[PDB]
Amino acid sequence: NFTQTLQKDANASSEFYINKLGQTQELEDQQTYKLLAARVLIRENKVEQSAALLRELGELNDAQKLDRALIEARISAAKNANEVAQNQLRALDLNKLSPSQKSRYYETLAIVAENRKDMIEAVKARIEMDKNLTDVQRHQDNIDKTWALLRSANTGVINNASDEGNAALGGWLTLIKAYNDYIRQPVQLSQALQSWKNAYPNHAAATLFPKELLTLLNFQQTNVSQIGLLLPLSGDGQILGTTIQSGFNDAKGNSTIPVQVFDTSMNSVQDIIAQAKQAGIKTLVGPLLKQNLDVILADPAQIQGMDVLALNATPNSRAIPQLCYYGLSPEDEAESAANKMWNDGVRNPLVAMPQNDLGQRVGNAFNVRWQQLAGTDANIRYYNLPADVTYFVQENNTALYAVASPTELAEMKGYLTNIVPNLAIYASSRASASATNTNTDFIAQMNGVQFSDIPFFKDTNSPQYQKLAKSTGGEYQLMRLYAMGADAWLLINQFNELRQVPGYRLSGLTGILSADTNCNVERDMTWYQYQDGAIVPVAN
């Protein structure tokens, strides 16, 4: 009678079923607890202990022999023994299984199909799984997994895919087809989803909508009525806030949206926020300085009832409702460098950061991203003199990423030409200045070096570019601040899209803009390379 426990869901921990052995007297009942533990051990990502415990099993009755083979095949699928896993499940009598056992049976199939990148068959497997589930939370997990398979499936296979008279598969295919067809237009996709829940009302997902789509069902376009602009426009950083203001205004154009300017150099940020609340302003851009942003982070409740696009990021930056961080951050240029370098074939690179507070953060943003692509920690080394790079290379003889001045970067390579002259050098936008990109003696010495910078510098002939280069006096920093202000107008009008729409992307003057889980605005950088006396865009 206790063997029948196998036919049900196993909701306890592995330690629970294993510890019951000391109290379990009968031999069959000891084996049952062993199988229940092995079943849960897989759900705990402990495959070896599951296979190991299976090796402790002795003599089993037929009901146990059956449950073991389920756990055997699931292990095989975990270890990518796809042909083995399937043959192990072809040997079972699918009629002898309970609903819970059929659920585990078809989940293993879905993993084999997913292992083989065969997404449609993996979805078909999870539909049969859903028919045998009883726990609501397990239902939701199957639906969340099912949605993830469709979202990774090739877009062509989905458009031409037939539902094969299968209503379940029909509703799934139509749902993903709407997602891919209108994800760039969320307002339109919201109408499609609401239509979907009336088209397939008895669909399992009509009741338990996948998590990724709940924010999209009743999505609402940003309706900016009033903006408050927090920038330093007097005293210190005046040029920063004024040039940023120039970009914001020029990108705003003939918009009726009233903007109220708040000068942080002459007013407290907590007083500004209070006055904004008083004037009925529900949308802010800024502040710019890290310290002033931390005033918000020192008490997030201040911005209760507002959408705020802060223009910087701090170590205290974190997930805060209706708060998103958008700064010309070196962490982004390092995260982009980790990507560029990886896609180019670089493995285990040397990273040269300055031994200051800014260098540690950027190195951490670099490595964390590198842990994603490489699964390893990179060589982050901190330099006090550009000449210290020599010993870093003298350790072993490859690609370098360095954050340094345009001249500091020229010293580094010169020190390395005798040591390793054919080294692939990557740098951040800090290595790009007007005084140096106009002189071929610098452009020639830097042949092969590539750096990240905003895509605005691709077109140095456009009238748009013309007017700005002469207006800023030829200083790239003032030109990037102008680009940020402009992209802030793009971003603050796409604010709700940014928080609610997965993978949302925007082509702005500062790069391809998107958001992470902490609504930190990421930037996909443009990469430029010095080639035979010219600077050409290599990527993006």
From Swiss-Prot:
Membrane topology qualifier: Lipid-anchor
Molecular function GO terms recorded: enzyme regulator activity
Keywords from the UniProt entry: Cell outer membrane, Cell shape, Disulfide bond, Lipoprotein, Membrane, Palmitate, Peptidoglycan synthesis, Signal
GO biological process, one term: regulation of cell shape
Cystines in this chain: 324-519
Pfam families assigned to the protein according to its UniProt record, in alphabetical order: LppC
Principal location listed in the UniProt entry: membrane
Subcellular location: Cell outer membrane
Keyword ATP-binding: no
Keyword Lipoprotein: yes
Database matches in InterPro entries: LpoA, Peripla_BP_I, TPR-like_helical_dom_sf
Cellular component terms per the entry's GO annotation: periplasmic side of cell outer membrane
Top-rank taxon, per record: Bacteria
Subunit structure, interactors included: Interacts with PBP1a.
Family per similarity comment: Belongs to the LpoA family.
Biological function: Regulator of peptidoglycan synthesis that is essential for the function of penicillin-binding protein 1A (PBP1a).
Name of the protein described by the UniProt record: Penicillin-binding protein activator LpoA
Organism this protein belongs to: Haemophilus influenzae (strain ATCC 51907 / DSM 11121 / KW20 / Rd)
